[PDB]
Amino acid sequence: AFYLLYYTAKNXSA
Amino acid sequence: AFYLLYYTAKNXSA
């Protein structure tokens, strides 16, 4: 699985 | 700071 976490303002396990 | 982090096998701020 692809795990993605991000923080841009805004905070995103397939 | 902003950031993105990811994990798949691969493992990636301002």
Q: How far apart are CA A8 and CA B2, in angstroms?
A: 5
Q: Identify whether the C-beta of residue B7 lies closer than 8 Å to the C-beta of residue A3.
A: yes
In Å, what resolution does this model reach?
A: 1.7
Structure tokens at A8: 């841009």
Specify whether the backbone of A3 is left (phi greater than 0), alpha (psi in -120 to 50) or beta: beta
The answer to whether the CB atoms of A3 and B4 lie below 8 A apart is no
Q: Chain B: give the shortest CA distance to residue A1, in Å.
A: 6
Residue B12 bridge partners (DSSP): none
Joined tokens for residue B3: 């950031």
| Contact residues for B5 (Cβ-Cβ < 8 A; gap 6+) | A4, A5, A6, B12
Residue type, B8: T
**How was this structure obtained?**
X-ray
- Please give the Cα distance from B3 to A14 (Å, whole number): 19
CB contact (8 A) between residue B4 and residue A1:
no
